[PDB]
Structure formats: C-alpha cells, structure tokens
Amino acid sequence: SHMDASVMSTTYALSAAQTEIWLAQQLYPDSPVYNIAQYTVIEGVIEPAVFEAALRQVIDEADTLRLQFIDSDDGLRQRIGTPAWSMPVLDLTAQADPQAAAQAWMRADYQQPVNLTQGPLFCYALLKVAPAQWMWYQRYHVIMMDGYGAYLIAQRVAYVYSALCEGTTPAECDFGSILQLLESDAQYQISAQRAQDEAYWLKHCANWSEPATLASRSAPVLQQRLRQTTYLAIQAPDARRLAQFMTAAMAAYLYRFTGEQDVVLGLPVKVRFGADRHIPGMKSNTLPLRLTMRPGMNLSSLMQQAAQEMQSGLRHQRYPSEALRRQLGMPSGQRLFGTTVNVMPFDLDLSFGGYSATNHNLLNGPAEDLMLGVYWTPGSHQLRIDFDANPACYTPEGLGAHQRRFIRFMQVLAADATQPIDSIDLLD
Ligand SMILES: CCCCCCCC(=O)SCCNC(=O)CCNC(=O)[C@H](O)C(C)(C)COP(=O)(O)OP(=O)(O)OC[C@H]1O[C@@H](n2cnc3c(N)ncnc32)[C@H](O)[C@@H]1OP(=O)(O)O
C-alpha cells in the first residue's frame, strides 16, 4: 500500500536511546513511568497571553516539541509534525488549599497514559496559587525530552517571556534542530567511535555481579516512583566532585547494608558533546560505575575510585547501557546496576519578566529499583536529595528510614574523610 510507503518516505528512524525507550514502554503500554515533569514557581505576576506567545515561540525554536510518532513495518518512526496543543490556565486562589489543588491537578496530568502516536507528548499549563504566585507546569515523555533538554527549554521560555514583557525582540535562539541530533546519532551507530566505546565497556564490565541493592526483591517497574525528599545544607566542590561524593557515599551505604564489595551503580550522563549541547531532545544515557569495597577504605579512597571511573569512562559515554547488556550476553531482565546516582547540577533559578522563579522536579523517569536524585544549583549552599524507588520494592516508611540513615551516614563520612566506612555507626 502506498500509504505505508509514504510513511517510510516522510519519517526518520528513532535514535538508539529512543528505541530503548520505545521497547521498554511497549512492555507496559499503560505504565506512565516514562514521563518527566517539573514545575517552575514564579514569585510575581504572569500575563498568560504573553506566556502563551513565549511558548509558541519556543515550540518553533525547539523542534523536538513538534515531533510526531507514526507506527511502521520497521517499528516506530518520527517526523517534524503539527501537534495539537493548548495551555490550560487555572486560577486556584479561591480554593481552600490552592497549593494542594495545584499539586493534584499536575499529578492528574502526569499520571495520564501517553500514547506515542496520538499525543500530546508534552503539556504546559499555568496555575495561579496565590496573589503573585504562579506555577508553570511542564511534562514530557522521555522519548522526546531528557532532563538537560527540559532545563534548556525552561531557560529559553523565561528569556523569551522576559523580552516579550519588556516589548523587545528576543535575541536569536541558539538551538540546533532535532533532525541534526538524529542524523548525528545515526552516524554514531555505524561509526568507529562506537566500536571503541563498545570495546571499552565490554572490558570494563566483563565480570559482573548481580547488583547490590537495599530491596528484598527485584521487579520491573510498572508504577510511578515512591519519592522521599530531603533538603540538605551543603556544609554536610563542583558537579564532578559532588557526583564522586554521592556515588562513593551510596556505594559505602550499600556495602554496609548488604556486605557486597563489588558495587556497580548507574550514573546518568548527558551525552551532549559539541553541537548537541544546544539541541533540546532525548540524549541521556546511564553508565555502569564500579566501586570495589576494599578492606579498610575510607571516603577518600572511594572518591579516588569514583574519580578514576569517571575520568576513564566519560569519554565513552555514548554507548547505550542497554546495548552493553545485550553484548555482554546478560540474561533477560538482569540489570548491570540496581541503584542509580543521578546528579543534576542544573541551575534551578529563572527570571520571568523581572520576577524570581525556581524549578522543582515532579517526575524523573522510571525507578527500576532505587534512584538517588540530587538537584544542585552550582555554587548554591543547598541540595535537594530525592530517593525515588520502585513501589514493588520499597515502602514509603522504609524508604524514609533509608534516606534518614543515608543522610546521617553521608554527613559522618564528610566529617572525617580518613575514617574507615566499616568504623561508622549507622542509625538503624
Ligand atoms: C521535566 C523535568 C526534568 C526531569 C529530568 C529527567 C531525568 C532523566 O531521566 S534524563 C537525565 C538527567 N540527568 C543528567 O543529565 C545527569 C547529569 N549528570 C552527569 O552527567 C554526571 O553526574 C556528572 C556530573 C559526573 C557529569 O560530569 P561532567 O563534567 O558534565 O562530564 P561530561 O561533560 O559528560 O564528560 C566529561 C568527559 O567527557 C570526555 N570527553 C570525550 N570527548 C569529549 C569532548 N569532545 N568534549 C569534552 N569532553 C569529552 C572527556 O574525557 C571529559 O573529561 P575531561 O573534560 O576531564 O577531560
């Protein structure tokens, strides 16, 4: 049939990362766990018609927002399309609990199933929760947006809105096109770079243990994450050393609870080199990071190991960890890591028409087991630490107990970096 021929002729293949997302989503086409979402709280007055004009401009500028997915013989295909969208504006200020009402509205959306061929794949909404307090809600399916991409979009919307508010022309966007990102990925899939990367990871992981984990069971994730959130003063570094510390601390904690001495963690990374640093879309990967719990090691030796792992492996970060699992001949369902340490050193602050604003994550993708999410504006004296967990594997209270124990443990670690991790009392 000519209609199938025309679909193939007018579309692009999924990238490697998108393909892994599509396959995972196909296993549970009703699981909403492939959404990411956040809201930006603005301390001021937002004019919705100007905000919507800013969103129209950024939907033109970031063409990943206009991707449409179409089923095909060779699987899912995509093109720059004409997605239907609107921007709900809800004034909740007369409600008994406007904040709770806003959270419930956002939650109702990000729990909605997202059919990839019908969309909508993103949602933008404005919620007024007090006099001079607005929330801009942002939701994406990860097949077309990752964390850094969402950050780029929020920065650009704030800038464009600010220009439109003051009646000036926004300076030209520095975004590249998603089609260039897809073409570069297609070339990488058949490049020599990829073969070197594959060799590196096959060597690095070639003798693997079943992952160390705090859970009594491992299970696919079907449900949205259980989340425990704690805010931490930084007195308890740059992004790289914050990641070194967080991975070392989580590995030491896993070792103290399970005794496992070969600890493999997941390290989400941006996979954004060169031009791809300016293209909103889905690029990110998650790397296996191995830390060997030796007899007597302290925090310093562990962060030494983590720094070495990152210096050795970040250059090879393009190689998808799912492809790595297949190439290693791992059994179906078996993972290289259970616990992931997702450090997001992305500026949380924005300015909208001269009004201060801050970003707050709602969903950060699927929680297969446990994910430590760390949100830090570089330079700030404050961290947000999320424990995101598979509800099939943890309880809210058990997760909260783990998070309190972990926060205390990590503070005692940072208090004396020469002290043996075996010598530290926990909270139990
Ligand atoms: C809607 C709300 C949003 C929801 C969020 C969505 C959540 C998701 O599921 S998506 C993932 C979100 N998380 C992230 O993006 C994680 C970001 N964090 C990280 O990447 C790691 O924690 C972190 C901090 C260690 C990365 O450190 P970083 O310094 O940025 O490393 P990175 O730039 O990637 O690579 C550096 C290394 O790459 C190597 N490299 C190879 N080629 C190059 C090249 N052309 N250029 C530069 N470096 C290169 C180098 O060896 C380099 O090392 P060095 O500069 O010292 O010589």
Numbering used by the authors: -1 to 234, 240 to 431
From the paper:
Nonribosomal peptide synthetases (NRPSs) are multimodular enzymes that catalyze the biosynthesis of diverse peptides with a wide variety of activities. The incorporation of an acyl into peptidyl backbone is usually implemented by a starter condensation (Cs) domain, normally located at the beginning of the initial NRPS module, via the formation of an amide bond to the α-amino group of the first amino acid residue, a process also known as lipoinitiation. Genome mining of two Cs domain-embedded cryptic NRPS biosynthetic gene clusters, rzmA and holA, in the bacterium P. rhizoxinica HKI 454 resulted in the discovery of two distinct types of lipopeptides, cyclic rhizomide A (1) containing an uncommon acetyl chain (C2) and linear holrhizin A (2) harboring a medium octanoyl (C8) chain. Similar to other C domain structures reported previously, RzmA-Cs adopts a “V-shaped” configuration and consists of two subdomains (N- and C-lobes) each representing the chloramphenicol acetyltransferase (CAT) fold.
